Symmetry: C2
Subunit: 277 residues, 2 copies
């Protein structure tokens, strides 16, 4: 009767002591934190951490009891796998290799992939093909290492539904490729959200919890968007989902991040409770 609840790294204060980060998450009542490896040189430099830095993270996790089971790899927005610039695409694949090695090192269960063929450039048939082939190569790296890659449902039309991610799953036909729906992103298009959630059961390994509006996929306060949280929670519970939920928010920049996080936590937990969890 346990429901693992997590908080996005970027909801908490920015300081790079992981022991304190994990200790804070613990006091706020979270079971885990999801690491961000984003477009910043600073967070990307984590992939070049020394052995001692990697083992310090493991130590902090074992000592606090607060896991880092997942990594959001949004760095691919900057170095996408579908880039027509072969130099950019090579660094995207290199980032993928290092993220997988990083996950092996520190015991990260799931690398959440960004479903962008290109983000800053215009998409075409070539970027789609290169994204597909880059994704296949990534999944082969993941197969060797035995590390799960889970495709996020995106703020972007290529990967804006569970159905589209399932299309990729059928193509790859690999146990290390799974689904990480974001119920906010899933609700901000023209999807039959409740059917999508049910359809993805069997491949859903984690769920991002955030609110959205059409065209607005970031920093929409809980309750001010279009997400039907209770219905999504009901669908997932009734279909047999037993995995974690991660509250995605960016309260890093707030006057009091911990206070913002605590409010969102209680808000989300109330909707889970209503849905029988």
């Amino acid at each position: 009767k346990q429901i693992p609840l997590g908080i996005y790294e970027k909801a908490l204060p920015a300081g790079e002591c992981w022991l304190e980060r994990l200790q804070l998450a613990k006091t706020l009542g979270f079971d885990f934190v999801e690491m961000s490896v984003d477009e910043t040189d600073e967070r990307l430099s984590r992939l070049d951490w020394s052995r001692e830095q990697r083992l310090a993270l493991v130590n902090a996790i074992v000592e606090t009891g607060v896991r880092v089971p997942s990594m959001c790899l949004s760095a691919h927005r900057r170095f996408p796998l579908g880039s027509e610039d072969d130099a950019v695409r090579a660094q995207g694949l290199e980032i993928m290799r290092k993220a997988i090695q990083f996950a092996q090192d520190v015991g990260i269960r799931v690398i959440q992939l960004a479903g962008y063929d290109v983000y800053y450039q215009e998409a075409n048939n070539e970027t789609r093909r290169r994204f597909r082939d880059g994704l296949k190569e990534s999944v082969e790296m993941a197969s060797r290492a035995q590390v799960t890659l889970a495709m996020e449902i995106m703020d972007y039309p290529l990967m804006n539904s569970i159905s589209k991610a399932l299309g990729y799953a059928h193509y790859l036909n690999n146990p290390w490729f799974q689904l990480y729906p974001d119920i906010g992103n899933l609700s901000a298009w023209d999807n039959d959200v409740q059917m999508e959630l049910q359809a993805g059961i069997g491949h859903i390994v984690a769920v991002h919890v955030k609110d959205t509006k059409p065209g607005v996929f970031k920093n929409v306060p809980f309750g001010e968007g279009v997400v039907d949280f209770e219905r999504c929670f009901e669908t997932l519970k009734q279909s047999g989902y037993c995995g974690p939920y991660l509250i995605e928010m960016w309260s890093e920049t707030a006057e009091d991040p911990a206070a913002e996080v605590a409010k969102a936590r209680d808000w989300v937990k109330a909707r889970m409770a209503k849905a029988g969890m």
Copy 2:
């Protein structure tokens, strides 16, 4: 790369020393054993410091421990009609999952015995099914892969039987860990099976058998080149583990060196380099 590993029990009976040896023998990883012995079970009760010591050694040598063979369920089976015994099985399952989380183990290989030292029946099968479901719920929360071995036991003696369970459970954290020796020691269409299971195969045990254990490589009925070419042509890109018990052979290191070269030659013949 073709990731190649060695079973824990193929090397003589500390982890730093074990991993450094495996490194010098050319192996990318070691598969840990959590068997019926109180000795290896006690690992599930390791202190935080003992767990951290193993991680330290893994990071230092570059030799991974990505999988655990959980054969302890032979002693505390999930289908046991004795509630106390079944409860011990489920507690072992919980502790094995927690141990894999702590130490960064990727895959726990499950034993597909409803019961082993007792005769099976509808009730043991029913109990095992429910225990499996509970185990998979634990694994879903922890995000740890449980991979069913294809067994020297009728309930799970083919990839098909494990796929049946996979369809029942419909959960991303339940996968397949075929043993090509076990697969070949019954009346299966083994190449059909290997192909059917692609999409769920996360690891492969490499051993020879007769219609089960310590059969020298090339002396049993397994067609290694055929199994390797089916796996390669089907798109398998995961690890291979050489299963042997040369811990107590005349010269353990010399035995595994020979087995490694023998296996790699069979792989080469199938187009794997």
